[PDB]
Design a protein around this ligand. Structure first.
Ligand SMILES: Cc1cc2nc3c(=O)[nH]c(=O)nc-3n(C[C@H](O)[C@H](O)[C@H](O)COP(=O)(O)O)c2cc1C
Ligand SMILES: Cc1cc2nc3c(=O)[nH]c(=O)nc-3n(C[C@H](O)[C@H](O)[C@H](O)COP(=O)(O)O)c2cc1C
Ligand SMILES: Cc1cc2nc3c(=O)[nH]c(=O)nc-3n(C[C@H](O)[C@H](O)[C@H](O)COP(=O)(O)O)c2cc1C
Ligand SMILES: Cc1cc2nc3c(=O)[nH]c(=O)nc-3n(C[C@H](O)[C@H](O)[C@H](O)COP(=O)(O)O)c2cc1C
Ligand SMILES: O=C(O)CCNC(=O)c1ccc(N/N=C2\C=CC(=O)C(C(=O)O)=C2)cc1
Ligand SMILES: O=C(O)CCNC(=O)c1ccc(N/N=C2\C=CC(=O)C(C(=O)O)=C2)cc1
Ligand SMILES: O=C(O)CCNC(=O)c1ccc(N/N=C2\C=CC(=O)C(C(=O)O)=C2)cc1
Ligand SMILES: O=C(O)CCNC(=O)c1ccc(N/N=C2\C=CC(=O)C(C(=O)O)=C2)cc1
Lengths: 210, 198, 210, 198
């Protein structure tokens, strides 16, 4: 009985390991819940617009009900993206690690959905902005694939990981505090089979209990 | 020194990080009248994301055999990398957006980290050398710098160091302006001082 | 009692004459029909993806029910764009003339909505593909603004007009044969006031009778 | 001759218009071993649309006073125009998409028609001279060429002539392959003949 939003961030299709692993979760979830709604939002194989100055002017307008129609057009994609999120209970993000972070498309999706007055708010206490998240009741699953090894907790390269740790922080800011990460490592060295098998078993167990 | 200046804010006149970087650049020019500055805009104009075509071309096992179509998939990348090779000092100006950098700057990084060109594999090895970087960043909030209560939330410039470090840019200076949504004088003064000695 | 799809193609906001003139029509239509639905689709101030080879492979797939999930993701924007069109009775397009044609964003929107099996079909008679439109019951209004003069019927530069004449042809291919064009000329020379006044009077009359 | 080759199909190996243009280019190179070819991809990589920032910059009443931000809005445009100025023969390969050209090619045209640079106003005047163009186009259907039953539906190459003509490219040859969805030998042979004399 969960409404799902699945956001796919790899540019690769059938060859994407993070997409493949997320679809394993999604299809397993579907077996346990034949009537559940799954919405898919592509941010890897299709371009997502970067934040523009026109976006900034509209999103942060002091009196939002006065936005011109052109300004509203600047926020239209964002509203649709935010709407999908509000209409979901569980958010699944699949993503590669690209250069120690996420693909630029995912960063752009994040930039569209953190919206003043919509997914976060603030007040000034003694002149200092205090921030409050506006999403509530959400969960998130991050499914990730990496070419190298050691980027996870306790790993030799843990300090170079600005992908899922950064995702955690951004999602938490808008109120998604329950976040699970499943990772496959060693993709470039292909061992990697063990890593993917373990990721699949983990996701199957999460699907059953979700 | 030859300077490549990468601007990441979508804002023009209103941008603090652009304005501060331009303060430095004008002061560096006075102290070194023969300096060349190349500007690469990644904030006010779109920069394409990495695609599957790009992955196939960039990681081609036998680059000398890339087809014309594959080379076309890498043309922007080659141009971007070329700008970096022809420079001594890299200046990057950027906002913090959602605890990281604007998507355009991430896209720029994704284009210039290139197997066989800016890094190699034997174990990974940087292929750029002799370069320095100055990162100029503006943020709406407070406490994202060294020793700050929000330091562990900062995935902008610390991530930049990691990516720059991987391709061999080790000498990196960060000058940050905080409290934009609520220091610029200090950052400015710091940038002028820096310009008078680089 | 018409459902409206308004597609705005100028990159300019408050300064857009074609956008301004179309909103005049839309607000006049709204006065006569308080309960009518108007959907707005921005193709000028926001990027619209160009057709890719991945798009081609999916749209023209011989057995569409076998498209992979990745392929479907390649068509997702297109489906949403086509859906807006099917859900409308009247299509309003506002557009500048740019270099004797339309802005690239509008061309991209057109490239997304002409879809095999969806807005057009074909069969082979003696080996020759015969095309059949799939949209029916639609009308279209094209509102256009031009910097120069003489691009309309009988004008000295009529043969250089590949904007609205080309729109007519593309819309007709998918079945929109009832098409009206309202044009303001002389924008770069600013006379132009006469041209805009006449365009407004024309659009107000069309709104009342629609 | 110096050649600028603009490719408009999103397709790679499978593209007919790209393949035919490459047949011509290879044959022109054999006949003129010292020729330089610049390739500009507008089909397989995105090309930005004109924005309002671009309009404000390009039609600036006093260009010498454009701010750095405005110049950045025109950087791609300047690079694209530069390629055109440095060439003698422009070769454009393109599909017909929906009775016109792919959106990328329209975007390319929108970037290179520039007030004060490729055309002027006194009455409009072309500023490019001494250039030729070869347009190589592939179409799925039949009868879109001169004397064809669908000639009045053709807004691809005839529109290209109008846009090219406005900026001063008057000498234009069109070679078309039709019936792709259902002539290439002829077009090919025609391209080889053309290469052996340009
Ligand atoms: C542009 C690019 C950047 C990459 N950066 C990293 C990286 O920083 N660290 C890493 O371990 N692997 C990196 N990789 C390897 C990918 O993370 C790995 O191939 C991953 O499985 C790709 O995700 P996908 O299979 O879902 O497409 C990179 C790959 C590409 C194409
Ligand atoms: C989309 C967006 C996201 C932002 N995210 C953060 C943030 O995570 N932390 C912060 O301190 N400020 C944030 N800000 C505020 C900007 O960092 C601040 O306005 C900065 O000065 C913008 O850079 P610029 O002036 O060079 O355009 C954000 C602003 C925008 C528009
Ligand atoms: C890039 C560009 C190309 C243009 N090309 C033409 C043209 O080919 N013919 C013409 O008469 N006006 C041309 N114009 C002028 C515009 O058509 C005119 O300013 C129009 O009103 C702009 O539409 P808008 O007001 O809705 O933004 C062009 C303007 C721009 C910015
Ligand atoms: C989106 C799209 C639109 C097309 N529109 C037309 C058309 O209007 N008329 C036509 O004859 N063929 C049309 N075609 C068929 C192509 O013109 C034909 O496949 C051509 O060879 C493609 O060029 P390329 O092989 O260089 O990629 C269209 C194809 C696509 C994918
Ligand atoms: O000394 C220290 O703590 C750290 C020193 N560096 C390491 O140990 C190290 C670095 C990268 C890595 N992953 N492969 C990657 C990383 C980044 C990429 O962009 C690509 C790519 O294919 O583009 C592949 C595993 C280990
Ligand atoms: O419990 C934990 O791990 C962390 C506890 N949260 C904090 O103390 C905190 C969070 C964010 C912050 N930055 N403000 C920002 C962040 C996002 C924006 O979009 C803007 C904006 O101006 O648009 C400004 C300062 C302090
Ligand atoms: O001899 C013949 O039949 C035709 C000879 N040319 C003409 O008479 C003529 C050309 C253009 C025009 N409109 N202004 C324009 C046209 C194209 C543009 O790109 C721009 C722009 O601002 O970018 C403005 C009016 C008349
Ligand atoms: O009555 C009138 O004005 C016109 C009468 N219609 C005709 O005779 C006619 C129309 C289109 C055509 N080209 N085929 C095309 C057009 C669009 C496509 O997307 C494809 C494709 O392969 O995807 C191929 C040939 C003939």
């Amino acid at each position: 009985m969960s409404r799902i939003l699945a956001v796919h961030a790899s540019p690769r299709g059938e060859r994407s390991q993070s997409r493949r692993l997320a679809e394993v979760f999604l299809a397993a979830y579907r077996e346990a819940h034949p009537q559940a709604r799954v919405a898919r939002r592509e941010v890897g194989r299709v371009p997502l617009p970067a934040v523009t100055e026109a976006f900034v002017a509209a999103a942060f307008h002091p009196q939002p009900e006065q936005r011109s129609l052109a300004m509203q057009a600047d926020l239209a994609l964002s509203d649709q993206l935010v709407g999908e999120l509000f209409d979901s209970d569980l958010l699944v993000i699949s993503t590669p690690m690209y250069n120690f972070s996420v693909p630029s498309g995912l960063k752009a999706w994040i930039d569209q959905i953190v919206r003043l007055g919509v997914t976060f708010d603030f007040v000034l206490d003694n002149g200092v902005a205090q921030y409050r998240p506006l999403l509530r009741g959400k969960r998130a699953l991050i499914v990730t694939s990496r070419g190298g090894h050691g980027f996870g907790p306790g790993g030799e390269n843990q300090a170079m990981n600005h992908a899922d740790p950064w995702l955690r922080t951004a999602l938490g800011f808008i109120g998604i505090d329950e976040v699970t990460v499943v990772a496959a490592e060693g993709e470039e060295s292909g061992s990697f089979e063990d890593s993917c098998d373990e990721a699949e078993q983990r996701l199957l167990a999460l699907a059953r209990s979700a």
